[PDB]
Design a protein around this ligand. Structure first.
Ligand code: TPP
Ligand code: TPP
Ligand code: TPP
Ligand code: MG
Ligand code: MG
Ligand code: MG
Lengths: 553, 550, 552
């Protein structure tokens, strides 16, 4: 027909977009109509929030922006949290929304608002197209800006008459966002010289160290040079089994981990793709001066606790390849060897169920271990936010890039199950596991109809506690009392069944391994009800370990 | 304790707030801690979206700002649509949110976000407090601005260190937002002269005509002067059983209603609390226009008032009422009223050729109306079911039919009914949605079960996003992205510990509804509906027919 | 019959007689269309001064001043102007070009997000994106600019929108409506609270200074015989008749007779008071008093401003309903002495010091000689600086809108362009403008406009060669000054280089003569007046409050 609506779909075609997540409405209608003619499969969502969470997951797993498409008013405003989360967690997303006609743009009329103004503080790019000719230009720049370091959200709004208008405007080439070269050579030399002269150099692998390419390079570096290392939560998957000896776990949330003590003992820290939002430098870069080398695709944020002595800004993996090429293996003096050894066995003992533990419910560590034993390396595991997620983020081993997905920017409740859906659409054929608590679960459980309608092979684990617990034990450590943390329990099994899904329940902690295998062998979506004992949770924020190791030294 | 958090709680005590809807988090948890000592009852929500909707319900039904309280980051950003909805539909709401400590406000850090900039476009008032001393001032101005005509949403954000900081700061008095006087008296006189000299003077009651005091005033005006009148959807309940004779239905959505032809035939139109968002003037609007409202009018190609009576709406109405006298109509205009009233009765009727194993929409509306007492509040969601409710479900009390008619936001029905039941203890509350919108906020059924709220939720079961579908069929002759698969509604209800009912055949409709009305605790009722008559809601038939009788 | 014509037609419907502007490419179609029909175009030398002029028209006529500019630097130069009007109750409408809609998101000459820039400093900031919407968007801009509280409205036109040919019809210029008075029972309440006061006082503020409000205020002050004070923008509330009940203009520093009056008051009635002129935390202090807020909009709650009664509605109507039903207050003995003492403190504070000697005029001598040289009805515009403090406290005004002060943003350089605006509003009358030397250069360029118009402006420069108001605050805080010194210029030959008339006061004794000589001159005249500023630190001095505190 050649409306503005067709120009939009043509862009999606040039961009190689396989799927569009959305919900139709009167203002964005022409575009949905034009998608009937061609373009990517439409995945109808049961909420624009979840549509955004789905696009985000696609962006994180593929490196090309996930696409979400919604109508005016509440269609658009329901995107806010989603885009915010994508934009602060390094995920390429492009959002396309409708608005009222240009003539009525300033009026009190149904579903009218300044779309671009709302999304301005929460995206890299937020625009509204006021001329049909401009559509291919605006859309193409949004894809590029979404993809360019640091990846985030782009939002593009269309008045209704703009996408309905007939025009002879030509499309433009989907010129892909270009790669940077590696960092300046002189900076790379300096960086190598500082690692070679260190008594205890260590690698801090961050958000953008967690991309597949970045991880491949990071592993060659760690293997050649033999550096100890830690991961941020979104760097999970850096580990391989033959790096386990050099691995000191995941830093974050509370300063009481072996990784923290290691970074403390370090005189040189090399950070890679490090976005401080995952764990503020004021928690780890303390207690003594210490050289900081910042390896990233964008310049560093200066902070009282973060003043890099060296910045290597360029393409992350290739910059790493250049350091790797000219570094050599680091020898550790006796003192540092013993520090490393001691940290390693504090790390080991942390991963164990307390010896005087007895219960009629599973311990969190038992859930974590059993889950890890029932799931092959290649399977993507998505995680929600809560105490369950602390246990997962610290103790759930991951061995491949993009196989453990955590929301460690906004810490947005409800991402797991929708993320699992997006993952299954990117990895057709594979099982996708999603893990949540019972609080965050109802934030997005509605999208179980999408999963069933798609016959997605998703396995969702609900940690059953019956409170907002991560908030509860923090309230106990601050005020020795809780507030607004309690809610009623629902029948998770019958909930799943009412959707046409499958419900299982761990009725005793010894059925855990069995019920898990069963979910994995099931056809279509499964929800698994797991009673958990959270009485150990308060110890997640303990200072015992920093204190013990303190008197060691 | 004299933290900033206590200063906040004290404002809520001073303001007479009985419920705060919320979800706790680290940056805001000091205010939640302070609520353990004194202050209103915390209602824990399963989604900040839904806490916002409930606060909207409280605001619409009491005139006092509803209060929602949330944490930083996604806690705040999840309020967006809620406050947008409230802000455009006339409901006083106060939102309170956390943010990161002042010193880290500029950094990439967990749950950080320029809160105030995000709500700037979608509220009357959006601010972040940067000094603990300023807390009582910023909160007290928020309540005032939320309530002041035209009522809307107010947003206040608090850095973590500001609510945790110990302080000597004094509270301020909750100075009530003041009412205006009536409109200028020479303006009132002018309007009385326009009505008394018109051939067919008519009243259009709008959004802010649906406040209880405005309705009581409007009824006296209608009865005394015997003017015909029409309702926007949010002015539902202006009608009294007494006034059914002068009543010409609800205007909205498509121009093809008896009310539309009436407004067209009128030489004078008195609009009361008319927010054009409910129905753009370019659809119903030569003739004289008298704009009566608590704020000045927006000028539009199709809306240029000859008279503006700006002041307190009920005051101004009374003044007009006091000095106006009965209008009597020439025979020409009586015939017009007779005909329009007749077209109106035909439209309210199930078509003659209708055959179906599912209920017609009108049969749901009729049985619902016949099963619910006039005083029972009925909330409604968004979709094809709501076109039917908005046009054909009669309301006779103020605030007993609640419709989202500024932002048309899916999912408002069930959370509104929860807010409503906390505002009217001892009463049943009815809510109506389609199956699409039901899953937008059905999570909150846990909350209704937790409170043992006497809610009866009716689900119109179709299996599609239909209101989108038949507009699509009319524009392109094909649908797109409107199909989803259905769930077992009864089992969905039972899994939450609520009661689930199902109308298995159209004749069971009366009894099943009755059963729901007498049930204990929350009830969900599955009601299959036949929508194949839905595309005629946008039909041009009636204006074409009436065109040639003239 | 383009979009540009639609814009000119709206200006005609609003009764706009003058448009202050500077042309550019993106907006020039509108400038074209103004050749055919419309209001006179006054070419400015800087978009800042065009904005100031507009503000002046708005303040003086009650209908929006109009300013028209091009895209990019044309529009951005408007920022301080609209901001100042938007915080001082002045209706202004601004019209600006932008790039074509197709190139709106591009890096291209003079492209910027116009609406976003003006959102935080206007009541109303919009961009039209369809030619049809022009009559609507503009009409609402005039009404919103006018609707109380009055201020700045900004409309932006992408270039292709005003050049586009259309058959769109215009829209009626529906006047912004009036409110009625406050509600009866509230009026009753206010009268009752006043009746039972031992010392009720009136505070006249910003919107108490419109002509109709002043007419009603004067009747109320006369009938009930209440003492009153003024905010700076409430100048001209006073009449010669009312000098007896008058306790001066409050503001800037809490050390004036008006402050002490307010402090002793048990009931304060405020009239159209915008706190920006003087924070309530400065006067509403040592003890409690009842506050009655009378205004066209609800009050801002403050730690030091929590009204017991709000009278919201049209200000002159509400004042009238109070005047009609109130009877005279009669002060007891204790309060009469109080009022008497304060009145003498007031009178002593207006006199040049005893041991004053100087080769240059003392400020009060400038204030005095200028007041006596100028008819009551003549409009006097004032700039910002130490000279303005002297003007604002001590220069009497007896007619509405004859003393204009920037008391919201305290914007430098407003005087001279405000006087240009005044003279266009009041043809055939002298207009006097007063500035310091520093603020003079902020807008002195616009003298070319005044000469080009043969405007009868008489501009007085207080010459001391420093940014003094900053400097003495710096000394009272830090015992040292910073960045307050600049060179000076020959004001007389400055004026002459523009084809204007330049006069100089070579000695304080020829002050009356050089002033009278300026009043009789044809065309613009600038006057160089050397001043001695050594007294200036005593403006922020703390003695009067202390001395009176011991007198109690
Ligand atoms: C959208 C949103 N609202 C509020 C919060 C604050 N918050 C963090 S954890 C949490 C509770 C999660 O509870 P649950 O999912 O049951 O996990 P659990 O701690 O019990 O394992 C809340 C409310 C948040 N992170 N996101
Ligand atoms: C939050 C939001 N998303 C999308 C829309 C667009 N929209 C309007 S009606 C509608 C259909 C709702 O369907 P349903 O609840 O099943 O009611 P039905 O039409 O079937 O009666 C949609 C998607 C909207 N109004 N609000
Ligand atoms: C645009 C602007 N810049 C700076 C200031 C701060 N300021 C206030 S008074 C003042 C000094 C003005 O001095 P001048 O005009 O020479 O008059 P004087 O103080 O000498 O009497 C300054 C710089 C201001 N108010 N406005
Ligand atoms: Mg839980
Ligand atoms: Mg449906
Ligand atoms: Mg000076």
């Amino acid at each position: 027909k050649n409306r503005g609506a067709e120009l939009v779909v043509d862009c999606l075609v040039e961009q190689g977009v396989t799927h569009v997540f959305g919900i139709p409405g009167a203002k964005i209608d022409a575009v949905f109509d034009a998608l009937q003619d061609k373009g990517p499969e439409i995945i109808v969502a049961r909420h624009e929030q979840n549509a955004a969470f789905m696009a985000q997951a696609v962006g994180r797993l593929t490196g090309k922006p996930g696409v979400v498409l919604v109508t005016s008013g509440p269609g658009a405003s329901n995107l806010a949290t989603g885009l915010l989360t994508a934009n602060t967690e390094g995920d390429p997303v492009v959002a396309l929304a409708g608005n009222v006609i240009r003539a009525d743009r300033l009026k009190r009329t149904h579903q009218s608002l300044d779309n671009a103004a709302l999304f301005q503080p929460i995206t890299k790019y937020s625009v509204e197209v006021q001329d049909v000719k401009n559509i291919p230009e605006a859309v193409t720049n949004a894809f590029r800006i979404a993809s360019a370091g640091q990846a985030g959200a782009a939002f593009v709004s269309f008045p209704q008459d703009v996408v309905n208008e007939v025009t002879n405007t030509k499309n433009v080439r989907a010129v892909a966002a270009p790669k940077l070269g590696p960092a300046a050579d002189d900076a790379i030399s300096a960086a190598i010289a500082k690692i070679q002269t260190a008594k205890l150099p260590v690698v801090l692998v961050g958000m953008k160290g967690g991309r597949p390419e970045a991880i491949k390079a990071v592993r060659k570096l760690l293997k050649k040079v033999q550096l100890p290392f830690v991961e941020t939560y979104q760097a999970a998957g850096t580990l391989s089994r033959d790096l386990e000896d050099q691995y000191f776990g995941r830093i974050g949330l509370f300063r009481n981990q072996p990784g923290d003590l290691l970074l403390e003992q370090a005189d040189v820290v090399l950070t890679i793709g490090y976005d401080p939002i995952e764990y503020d430098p004021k928690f780890w870069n303390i207690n003594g001066d210490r050289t900081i080398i910042h390896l990233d695709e964008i310049i560093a944020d200066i902070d009282h606790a973060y003043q890099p002595d060296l910045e290597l800004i360029g393409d992350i993996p290739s910059t790493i390849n250049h350091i790797e090429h000219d570094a050599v293996k680091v020898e550790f003096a006796e003192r540092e060897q013993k520090i490393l050894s001691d940290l390693k066995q504090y790390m080991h003992e942390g991963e164990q169920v307390p010896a005087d533990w007895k219960s009629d419910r599973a311990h969190p560590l038992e859930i974590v271990k059993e889950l890890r034993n029932a799931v092959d390396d290649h399977v993507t595991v998505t995680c929600d936010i809560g105490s369950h997620a602390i246990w997962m983020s610290r103790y759930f081993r991951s061995y491949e890039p993009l196989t453990l997905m955590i929301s460690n920017g906004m810490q947005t409740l409800g991402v797991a199950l929708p993320w699992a859906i997006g993952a299954s659409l990117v990895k057709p054929g594979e099982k996708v596991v999603s893990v949540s608590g019972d609080g965050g679960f109802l934030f997005s459980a509605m999208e179980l109809e999408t999963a069933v309608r798609l016959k997605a092979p998703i396995v969702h684990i609900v940690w059953n506690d019956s409170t907002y617990d991560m908030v509860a034990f923090q309230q106990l450590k601050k005020y020795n009392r809780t507030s607004a943390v309690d809610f009623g329990n629902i029948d998770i099994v019958k909930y799943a069944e009412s959707f046409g899904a499958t419900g299982l329940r761990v009725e005793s902690p010894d059925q855990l391994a069995d019920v898990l295998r069963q979910g994995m062998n099931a056809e279509g979506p499964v929800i698994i009800d797991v009673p958990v004992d959270y009485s150990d949770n308060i110890n997640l924020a303990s200072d015992k370990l920093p204190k013990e190791f303190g008197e060691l030294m």
